[PDB]
């Protein structure tokens, strides 16, 4: 039987959670994907020679019922905490999600990657690579910049996260 890995996408609105999920899943950039939809996706992928299945839960703010949210988080094995390099407030918001995840999983070593998305909009960058890295260092997690549009580092973030999961 193939090993199953559960990944959870978290972050504020419009940072690219759905766009990253769909690029990785179906290899296509889907613009204006319905913002209030939360859904799960699964498929087989090859990680370092081994065939495994990845399950991705794409969350949305609309679903704010505590019991439901906490259940989704407790079921996740790794998290991609996404923000938009073009929105300073989304970067600041990452602290909020980090707090909720730590509250529910009580594990400061839980597989977690800080993801700065929309790297293709460099000319609108409001968050420098320096400040993002400093924060990542403080939480002892790695930082990766992606673009759901050009697909830069998209496979890398999911793959790197699965590797951390594989080691815990
Ligand atoms: N240029 C650019 N736009 C992006 C990127 N990722 C998402 N977007 C756009 O940002 C908007 C919000 O994306 P969405 O995936 O719905 O964000 P979510 O609310 O986090 O699920 C959509 O209009 C996307 O087409 C990216 O990497 N580059
Ligand atoms: Mg979405």
From Swiss-Prot:
Q: Please list the reactions this protein catalyses.
A: GTP + H2O = GDP + phosphate + H(+)
Provide the GO MF annotations for this entry.
Edg-2 lysophosphatidic acid receptor binding; G protein activity; GTP binding
Q: What does this protein do?
A: Multifunctional GTPase involved in a variety of cellular processes including gene expression, cell migration, cell proliferation, oncogenic transformation and membrane trafficking. Accomplishes its multiple functions by interacting with distinct downstream effectors. Acts as a GTP sensor for GTP-dependent exocytosis of dense core vesicles. The RALA-exocyst complex regulates integrin-dependent membrane raft exocytosis and growth signaling. Key regulator of LPAR1 signaling and competes with GRK2 for binding to LPAR1 thus affecting the signaling properties of the receptor.
Q: Report the membrane topology from the UniProt record.
A: Lipid-anchor
Outline the subunit composition. Answer: Interacts (via effector domain) with RALBP1; during mitosis, recruits RALBP1 to the mitochondrion where it promotes DNM1L phosphorylation and mitochondrial fission. Interacts with EXOC2/Sec5 and EXOC8/Exo84; binding to EXOC2 and EXOC8 is mutually exclusive. Interacts with Clostridium exoenzyme C3. Interacts with RALGPS1. Interacts with LPAR1 and LPAR2. Interacts with GRK2 in response to LPAR1 activation. RALA and GRK2 binding to LPAR1 is mutually exclusive. Interacts with CDC42.
**Transmembrane residues, as ranges?**
none
Q: Which family does it belong to?
A: Belongs to the small GTPase superfamily. Ras family.
Q: Does the keyword Coiled coil apply?
A: no
Question: A single GO CC term, please?
Answer: Flemming body
How is this chain's activity regulated?
Answer: Alternates between an inactive form bound to GDP and an active form bound to GTP. Activated by a guanine nucleotide-exchange factor (GEF) and inactivated by a GTPase-activating protein (GAP).
PTM entry text: Prenylation is essential for membrane localization. Phosphorylated.
Its localization reads: Cell membrane; Cleavage furrow; Midbody, Midbody ring; Mitochondrion
List the ranges annotated as motif Effector region.
Answer: 33-41
Natural source organism:
Saguinus oedipus (Cotton-top tamarin)
Write the span of the intact protein that is present: 11 to 178 of 206
- From the Swiss-Prot or TrEMBL record, give the protein name: Ras-related protein Ral-A
- Supply the alphabetized keyword list: Cell cycle, Cell division, Cell membrane, Exocytosis, GTP-binding, Hydrolase, Lipoprotein, Membrane, Methylation, Mitochondrion, Nucleotide-binding, Phosphoprotein, Prenylation
Task: Give the residues the record marks as binding GTP.
Answer: 11-19, 117-120
Broad class of where this protein is predominantly found: membrane
């Amino acid at each position: 039987s193939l090993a199953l890995h559960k990944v959870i996408m978290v972050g504020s609105g419009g940072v690219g959670k759905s766009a990253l999920t769909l690029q990785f899943m179906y290899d296509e950039f889907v613009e204006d994907y319905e913002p209030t939809k939360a859904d799960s996706y699964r498929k087989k992928v090859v990680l370092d020679g081994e065939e495994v299945q990845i399950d991705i839960l794409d969350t949305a703010g609309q679903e704010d019922y505590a019991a439901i949210r906490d259940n989704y988080f407790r079921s996740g094995e790794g998290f991609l905490c996404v923000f938009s390099i073009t929105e300073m407030e989304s970067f600041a918001a990452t602290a909020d999600f980090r707090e909720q995840i730590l509250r529910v999983k009580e594990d400061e070593n839980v597989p977690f990657l800080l993801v700065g998305n929309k790297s293709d909009l460099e000319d609108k960058r409001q968050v420098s690579v320096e400040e993002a890295k400093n924060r990542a260092d403080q939480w002892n997690v790695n930082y990766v910049e992606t673009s759901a549009k050009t697909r830069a580092n998209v496979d890398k973030v999911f793959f790197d996260l699965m590797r951390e999961i594989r080691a815990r």
